[PDB]
């Protein structure tokens, strides 16, 4: 039944706030936590995300500085969160994974776990956790991965899911993002069950090229993200058969434990006109609607989950999903039979009669790790910017080890791509 949601750092709290605004709207929950919807489908699985005549997100808001969480509290749905679930320090993490993971984050993490435990303890049957964060900064990356490790120690038989924003030079705050992301990926490989890889470069290019936004803001990017998070959690939050819980999703999507990094996608993305099931299906599988900046035609799908939302012919959905597989059969590994599963939920996202969300486990995700790996090495060969990390107690050897582990992941994807 219950999922506990955690959002850490600037990026993590910004996208996490938007996620809660969007799903609260879908479930008919207003900013004061009152239900004012008109379909029983809205409430049937509400307790997955909301404690209970008011509904309060099962959500913990974490940061090492107060500013983003002050904006959250002032923002649209800011009063819906439980006030005790805001856990924050004052010193910040300076875009530094070591600060998040080892020094500043270490001072705050026990207070976060106290709140996690209080939420877990009033669950009838906790399924596990979802974390929103970036990998490029300090708090979401360093403190978020510290939290994941501590949660795993205290709840080792629960599922850990992340929405992880991956940095890009094209949409960048500091030069040390590749260091922070490489250190984080090493943690995610060992300690998550499912990670949605959301590439800031993909978000930007979707906004700029497809949506025709001349100058995208983080706000624009987060709109994309929150739409995708809504889509990918649909089957957790509404009645249905397929991928209806975190553990069932993992069993269907993860054939080898380390290869749990998914490329999500959304359709439609266009700059009133009716969308057809054919169009949704074709757009959902097109590289330009995917959020990891990897070309799926450069690899193979191990597994895919597709979710369609809205009133539409179930027959035509099954038909088009079979057309795509049968027509592009070479991009699907042949040694996992029937590796594409399709769900359908009657409730569309706000503003859309019909939508589809894609979750692919593709060997092409190797390209994202390789890019981060190349940007890490260009700096690490000259030990550039390392003093920020060594001043917090870290040694060079830990960087060598993270780099190796991420290169190992890349090789593992390549192996299955060739098999």
């Amino acid at each position: 039944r219950e999922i506990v949601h955690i959002q850490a750092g600037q990026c993590g709290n910004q996208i996490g706030a938007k996620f809660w605004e969007v799903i609260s709207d879908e479930h008919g929950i207003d900013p004061t936590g009152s239900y004012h919807g008109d379909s029983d489908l809205q409430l049937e699985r509400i307790n997955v995300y909301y404690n209970e005549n008011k509904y309060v997100p099962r959500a913990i808001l974490v940061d090492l500085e107060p500013g983003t969480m002050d904006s959250v509290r002032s923002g649209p749905f800011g009063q819906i969160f439980r006030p005790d679930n805001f856990v924050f320090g004052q010193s910040g993490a300076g875009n530094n994974w070591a600060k998040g993971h080892y020094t500043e984050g270490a001072e705050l993490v026990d207070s976060v776990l106290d709140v996690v435990r209080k939420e877990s303890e009033s669950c009838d049957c906790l399924q596990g956790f979802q974390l929103t964060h970036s990998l490029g900064g300090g708090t979401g990356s360093g403190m978020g991965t510290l939290l994941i490790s501590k949660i795993r120690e205290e709840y080792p038989d629960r599922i850990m899911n992340t929405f992880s924003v991956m940095p890009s030079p094209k949409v960048s705050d500091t030069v040390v993002e590749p260091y922070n992301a490489t250190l984080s990926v090493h943690q995610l490989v060992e300690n998550t069950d499912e990670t949605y890889c959301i590439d800031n470069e993909a978000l930007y290019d979707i906004c700029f090229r497809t949506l025709k936004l001349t100058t995208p803001t983080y706000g624009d990017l987060n709109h994309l993200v929150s739409a995708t998070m809504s889509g990918v959690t649909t089957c957790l939050r509404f009645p249905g058969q397929l991928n209806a819980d975190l553990r069932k999703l993992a069993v269907n999507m993860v054939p080898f434990p380390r290869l749990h990094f998914f490329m999500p996608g959304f359709a439609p993305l266009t700059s009133y006109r009716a969308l057809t099931v054919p169009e949704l299906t074709q757009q959902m599988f097109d590289s330009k609607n995917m959020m990891a900046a990897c070309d799926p035609r450069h690899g193979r799908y191990l597994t895919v989950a597709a979710i369609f939302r809205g009133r539409m012919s179930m027959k035509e959905v099954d038909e088009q999903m079979l057309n795509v597989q049968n027509k592009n059969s070479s991009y699907f590994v042949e040694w996992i039979p029937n590796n594409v599963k399709t769900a359908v939920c009657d409730i569309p996202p706000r503003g859309l009669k019909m939508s589809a969300t894609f979750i692919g486990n593709s060997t092409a995700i190797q390209e994202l790790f390789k890019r981060i790996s190349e940007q890490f090495t260009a700096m690490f060969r000259r030990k550039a910017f390392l003093h920020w990390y060594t001043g917090e107690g870290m040694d060079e050897m830990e960087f060598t080890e993270a780099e190796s582990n991420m290169n190992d992941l890349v090789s593992e994807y390549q192996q299955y791509q060739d098999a």
Partner: protein, 434 residues
């Protein structure tokens, strides 16, 4: 009179069970509150229908059934639905978290913790029986509970009820409605561990039923509700002999005697006709009997022309007399490819019940004057094992998804042992069928 206990395991087992008990009520004249005004012995008796129903002093007719699922949402529908007053809480067993499509989680991790409670509830039903015949066990192959819990349960039932028959109604996986990539693994694990514990198993391939619903009932996208109404009709045809007056298949042991001469080859093919749309000209005995030899009407798509028969049973309901049956068989033998093995007689056992099929009011199936279910033990059903085994092989060769099972404490060698048993099974069918 000898009782039969029905056990419904996992989502598929439970939802099919629900459909079956509702149809049984309608066939016997039992109301949703359990009252049966035609039953003049109040608070007891030893009628044929008492094989499936006990009676209380107040005249409630209570299914001899246990429902078991590792999460609560499906059984909660039974608890709150139309036939809720039929069952007492002790017949309805739910855990909190399911087997996540993982045989090992169902069999080992969660199964260990609920098996004793399930046995105690079955024992409470057994203690009310004067001459328990055995068990009918309904489950999926593909689910973690249907696969993993059922095989534990079947083993423990052989220990605690060692002389009792056990029959299965098993749902074979079809990707058109399946919910897990690993269903072939689950299927093979459960078939390996259950094989020595089951006396007779009726496998239903969701692909075959889906297609019958699409083609004959004109449903564009069948739901489990559509599928389960059809399945319940077939199930009812099969169990009718236990619940009404008759001289064929009147106890569980006769299923084996009449259909299963070799213990491992215990999977009869069920074929059913006619299936006609309620929204849409009455077929004769000849036509429905001829339809039993059509792959399109089979519960598992396969080609009997290219195997051999070991036994064949025709189960008629409605307006059928022996004369017309015999004339139909005569014709069909001159037209169709019906080869028996050399060491069994070529012939048919026939049962007729005069009550035509009941259908559920406003269901999809039209009322017909006559219907038939053929149960044939043909080597052609091994096509289905070939299909599954090949899927298993493709994934297993890369160890895809194996870690989920190992992580629940199953050893990897249980995969290869299950697979080796299936290879010996395929070879048993080939040797009989050559």
């Amino acid at each position: 009179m000898r009782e039969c206990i029905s056990i419904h395991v996992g989502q598929a087992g439970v939802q099919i069970g629900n459909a079956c008990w509702e149809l049984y009520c309608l066939e016997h004249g039992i109301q949703p509150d359990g009252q049966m005004p035609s039953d003049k012995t109040i608070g007891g008796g030893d009628d044929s229908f008492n094989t499936f129903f006990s009676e209380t002093g107040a005249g409630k007719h209570v299914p001899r059934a246990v429902f078991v699922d590792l999460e609560p949402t499906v059984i909660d529908e039974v608890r709150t639905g139309t036939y809720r007053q039929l069952f007492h809480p002790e017949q309805l067993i739910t855990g909190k978290e399911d087997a996540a499509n993982n045989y090992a989680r169902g069999h080992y991790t969660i199964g260990k913790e609920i098996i004793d409670l399930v046995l105690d509830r079955i024992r409470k039903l057994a203690d009310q029986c004067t001459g328990l015949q055995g068990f009918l066990v309904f489950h999926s192959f593909g689910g973690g509970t249907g696969s993993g819990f059922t095989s534990l349960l079947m083993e423990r039932l052989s220990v605690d009820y060692g002389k009792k028959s056990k029959l299965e109604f098993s749902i074979y996986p079809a990707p058109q409605v399946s919910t897990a990539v690993v269903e072939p693994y689950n299927s093979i694990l459960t078939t390996h561990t259950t094989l020595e514990h089951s006396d007779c198993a009726f496998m239903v391939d969701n692909e075959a039923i889906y297609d019958i619903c699409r083609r004959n009932l004109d449903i564009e996208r069948p739901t489990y509700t559509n599928l389960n109404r059809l399945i319940s009709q077939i199930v009812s045809s099969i169990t009718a002999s236990l619940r009404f007056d008759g001289a064929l298949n009147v106890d569980l042991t006769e299923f084996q005697t009449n259909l299963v001469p070799y213990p491992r080859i215990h999977f009869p093919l069920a074929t059913y006709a006619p299936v006609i749309s309620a929204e849409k000209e009455q077929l004769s005995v000849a036509e429905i009997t001829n339809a039993c030899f059509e792959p399109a009407n089979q519960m598992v798509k396969c080609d009997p022309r290219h195997g051999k028969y070991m036994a064949c049973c025709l189960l008629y309901r409605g307006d059928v007399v022996p004369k017309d049956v015999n004339a139909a068989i005569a014709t069909i033998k001159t037209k169709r490819s019906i080869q028996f093995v050399d060491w069994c007689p070529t012939g048919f056992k026939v049962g007729i019940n005069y009550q035509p099929p009941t259908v559920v009011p406003g269901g999809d199936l039209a009322k017909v004057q006559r219907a038939v279910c053929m149960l044939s033990n043909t080597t052609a059903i091994a096509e289905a094992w070939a299909r599954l085994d090949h899927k298993f092989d493709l994934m297993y060769a890369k160890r895809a998804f194996v870690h989920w099972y190992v992580g629940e404490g199953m050893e990897e060698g249980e995969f290869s042992e299950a697979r080796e048993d299936m290879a010996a099974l395929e070879k048993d069918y080939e040797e009989v069928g050559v």
